Amino acid sequence: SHMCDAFVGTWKLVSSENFDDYMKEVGVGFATRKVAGMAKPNMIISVNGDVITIKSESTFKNTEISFILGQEFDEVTADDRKVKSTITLDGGVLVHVQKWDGKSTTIKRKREDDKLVVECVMKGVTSTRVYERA
Ligand SMILES: Cc1noc(-c2ccc(Cl)cc2NC(=O)C2=C(C(=O)O)CCC2)n1
């Protein structure tokens, strides 16, 4: 019933690359980076009508956002930034832009084979986090 269907489900982190550097660029402090980098979240994605919900559950923090595509919302990130976020679908990729303090970071989620690939960019730095079905 919608192309956003290939994201729905329960996903578990299986690989991370460059995440510490991404977090440094975002401005996350040492202790949060270390504990955050250890986390192995599950990502739970659901759809109800026009509302998409993404939950991240881990030993560090449980976070949840709900949103409508293209409609800005205020978000508290896991590292406690208060950001203005918009999430859109662009050619089959979920594109999440977070703005705060004159900065911006973009998080892209895409289906590739049986994985959900998360690419996180802050200025020159890209982190790639790969999830598989739980
Ligand atoms: C920045 C930043 N500072 O702390 C954190 C973070 C902290 C804890 C936990 Cl448990 C996960 C985190 N972040 C993630 O997992 C992220 C992605 C993911 O969903 O893979 C996409 C980008 C961030 N992110």
Curated annotation (Swiss-Prot):
Motif (Nuclear localization signal): 24-34
Phosphotyrosine modification, residue list: Y22
One Pfam family per UniProt: Lipocalin
Residue numbers bearing the Phosphoserine modification: S15
Main location (coarse class): cytoplasm
UniProt record, GO biological process: brown fat cell differentiation; cellular response to lithium ion; cellular response to tumor necrosis factor; cholesterol homeostasis; fatty acid transport; long-chain fatty acid transport; negative regulation of DNA-templated transcription; positive regulation of cold-induced thermogenesis
Matches recorded under SUPFAM superfamilies: Lipocalins (SSF50814)
Keywords: Acetylation, Cytoplasm, Lipid-binding, Nucleus, Phosphoprotein, Transport
Binding site for a fatty acid: R129, V130, Y131
GO molecular function, one term: long-chain fatty acid transmembrane transporter activity
Modified residues (N-acetylcysteine): C4
Protein location: Cytoplasm; Nucleus
One of the record's GO cellular component terms: lipid droplet
Subunit architecture: Monomer. Homodimer. Interacts with PPARG.
Domain comment as written in the entry: Forms a beta-barrel structure that accommodates hydrophobic ligands in its interior.
Function: Lipid transport protein in adipocytes. Binds both long chain fatty acids and retinoic acid. Delivers long-chain fatty acids and retinoic acid to their cognate receptors in the nucleus.
Family: Belongs to the calycin superfamily. Fatty-acid binding protein (FABP) family.
Name of protein: Fatty acid-binding protein, adipocyte
Upper lineage: Eukaryota, Metazoa, Chordata, Craniata, Vertebrata
Protein encoded by which gene: FABP4
